Amino acid sequence: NIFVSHRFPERQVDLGEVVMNFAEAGSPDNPALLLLPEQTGSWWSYEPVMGLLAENFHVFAVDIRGQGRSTWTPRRYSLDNFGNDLVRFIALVIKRPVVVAGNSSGGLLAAWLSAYAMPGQIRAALCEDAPFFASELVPAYGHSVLQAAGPAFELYRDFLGDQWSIGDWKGFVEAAKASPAKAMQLFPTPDEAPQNLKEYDPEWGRAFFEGTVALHCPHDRMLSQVKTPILITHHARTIDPETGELLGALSDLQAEHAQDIIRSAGVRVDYQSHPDALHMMHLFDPARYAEILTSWSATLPA
Template structure:
């Protein structure tokens, strides 16, 4: 739910019937076209039942290098990584999973907290991947990645934090963040009403970003809710809004709103000391920090302030901040740079990856990525 995405969607101007047709085609077929490229790159979807009893859905790419595990953001799914999966497959052995409560993984209400999710990820690495990983977490996935890297350092060789909300999810600050008013609050209110059974329909009418459309708000809500009634098992796709805007709610039809409610009640990070966790991470890390601002109403639109990012990087042993000129969904907006950062992360420190026998030893800078 990014400010830049919302502004782009609100500013759409269509000229001519041909332009309208192409625009609608692009907006409604982008996901299918990206999925086709992912399949062509050799990715296969599978599932695995963890010791906790939770069944996780994941996708695995061809074995072309060190293992990478991708943890998506709240309200998303593994398919959100479609823009970067083909590029990563050239140099890595990539896994991306549906976090519990998302996609087709099990819903696990009562276990939507950093500790429980972290244990599931550690078990997944041990049982499915079987070697240390480069771990990348987007947004809330970055908080889970921090927990995993700190608690299971033998399972994590390096970390790419993609615009995680370090410190801004703490109870004293969360109520003045965009995520709290845009997703956590509507999810909480949805679970305490019975007039609307479909969370996507409820969310589209009660989120924060819909206000950016001004007088067009009611028309968008009406169209979206009709679409949901006609296509209850499909992602909500609005032909008149661009892919990056559609992607912000494309996976809500498979999302458990109890996950977002855990951010409202603060059960999400019960017992999770972010500063102490970061101090225990000694692996090479890159902290990607995307655009942010404080609104006139005092709401943080974005994951972190500059001070938050500096504080987090200062607590990490081997950290480099990469400031990017994108919205919160960096890997969607600039997939090429995301892939490049993976290569840079490998070269940032001396990272050991015990992999196939013929590749044991140190990973070198053979990937041909651009360096800063």
């Protein structure tokens, strides 16, 4: 009960297990657009850009399970459960085919739906800076989660704890600043826990760090099972020259393989590299993100 006000009305739908919170904008005569936030991001990660997209889409921004006003589900955090929630959401609330756009963790889920959603649910998928492979424990190519974003997710577990059962925010901030992981500086460490983190279940991080979230969803297989056109945006990424860490969502090599996997599935795939963009372009450069999304959606078949 730590939530705040926002610039769109919020509504909740019972999917069976999770009660998913979401916001709605746009005209139902425009194409439906499902927005999936990143890890630690609530639906209002897209709040600045929703005004822009609502001009041309009927947009649905949702709180994914274990986040925001949506239901926290201990012991049940997996890409399969995340995606099937979204399958039920599309079927119970949207009731039309959708273009799905997801940032990072949400990008993995946009690709998850394009491969494993109910027939006809997904017209196309936008993957904004998705950590393909780089979020797996034992990826088929390139850095593992332990060599990229792992350290921050490990701290969420060790200091915030499942369902905020530890809550040592001060201890987390000090461990983060003192961590030898160069990628740790990509995660914010304010003196007071930010709103999005307070709406976040740290067992997300435990699941990504321990390799359990995508145990049943190997990325090389998921990417080969997609059935709808996919757009891959690749933002800032660098390999630290002292520690070898991946500072970014995925490496150049991992993005190449993901393109080749999709291409071999016979599915249209486009790739845009934005090496100066921030990880969450939809939030910190919503104008640029809206243009990319709106333009790419215009090239999709009706």
